[PDB]
């Protein structure tokens, strides 16, 4: 029943600089276990739907790295022990995302990133022609 | 290959910043020497070895301060004590075979 | 297709930029890596775009020495 009344105090100063428009934002998460990435996709999709982003999710093909090492510590080169590192992929595309909405979505996504995965963002910012090109100069 | 193509090849090289005048195959290595980072300055090379001096010294001081207890160093000291008791220790300087 | 290139200027730009232009999709891709920072590369990348356009309109004197084997059509 007893709660801290009005414990919210953030400020959002709306300046005069025009916002940056991103044509399309691509997020590619890579990890070792599918289950973590499967849950992470659900978290990203659920948050994206609530913000109204209309995202699409696809799974790029995986790649497997293998290498071979000797077994014993002396001679015996006919017996090998192999190892394998598996990197599973998952891509989340974002379309028609403004700069202001991009900042909050990415930082909210990045802070909740699990320890066993990492991600790369490819932002396709769009803008008009340069002043020299736009303004007629021969 | 015509004179028109030579100008276009040079004009494109001027804008993008490559070498304009013709250059020998062996003479292009000097560009490669400065374009890339030298092998001796890469972080993988000069920082290859962890500083064992700090790692060993730090745990040495913490062992004497009672904050870190090392089993392995205790094993050496305990066995070293037994050798002294048995009468077989390390002689001082100038005591090996000169006597 | 969204620029103000002339018939002569567009042909020179394709012959100047080289393989960075795709003949099917009519898209020009400029990739810059020399500048240490992304802001310097962005300023350098836009610098290449504007200097490649102001140069495609300079019909220099030697340009008339065209060979019949160098014509694209």
């Amino acid at each position: 029943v007893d709660v801290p009344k009005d414990m919210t105090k953030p400020e959002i100063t709306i300046s005069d600089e025009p916002d940056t428009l991103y044509k399309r934002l691509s997020v590619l998460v890579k990890g070792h276990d599918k289950a973590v990435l499967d849950s992470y996709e659900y978290f990203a999709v659920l948050a994206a739907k609530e913000l109204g982003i209309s995202i699409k999710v696809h799974e790029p093909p995986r790649k497997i790295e293998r290498f071979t090492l000797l077994k014993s510590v002396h001679i015996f080169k006919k017996h090998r022990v192999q190892y394998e590192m598996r990197t599973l992929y998952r891509c989340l595309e974002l379309e028609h995302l403004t700069g202001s909405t991009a900042d909050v979505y990415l930082e909210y996504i990045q802070r909740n990133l699990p320890e066993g995965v990492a991600m790369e963002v490819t932002k396709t910012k769009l803008e008009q022609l340069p002043e020299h090109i736009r303004k007629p100069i021969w | 290959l015509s004179e028109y193509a030579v100008r276009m090849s040079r004009l494109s090289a001027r804008l993008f910043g490559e070498v304009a005048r013709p250059t020998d195959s062996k003479s292009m290595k000097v560009v490669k020497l400065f374009s890339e980072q030298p092998l001796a300055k890469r972080k993988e090379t000069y920082d290859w070895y962890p500083n064992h001096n700090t790692y060993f010294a730090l745990m040495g001081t913490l062992r004497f301060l009672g904050l870190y207890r090392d089993e392995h160093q205790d094993f050496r000291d305990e066995q070293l004590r037994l050798k002294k008791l048995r009468g077989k220790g390390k002689p001082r300087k100038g005591e090996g075979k000169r006597a | 297709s969204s620029l103000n290139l002339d018939d002569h200027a567009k042909k020179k730009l394709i012959k100047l930029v080289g393989d960075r232009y795709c003949k099917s999709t009519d898209v020009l891709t400029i990739k810059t890596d020399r500048c240490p920072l992304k802001r310097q590369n962005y300023d350098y990348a836009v610098y290449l775009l504007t200097v490649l356009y102001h140069e495609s309109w300079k019909t220099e004197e030697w340009e008339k020495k065209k060979t019949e084997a160098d014509m694209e059509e």
Binding site: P130, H132 | R7, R10, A20 | V51, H54, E60
Partner: peptide
């Protein structure tokens, strides 16, 4: 034998000093 190092080439870096500074 041949010799022609002074190729008839013309290009001025200072011509594009303007776009170099600002858009």
């Amino acid at each position: 034998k041949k010799e022609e190092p002074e190729l008839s080439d013309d290009f001025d870096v200072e011509q594009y000093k303007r776009f170099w500074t600002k858009k």
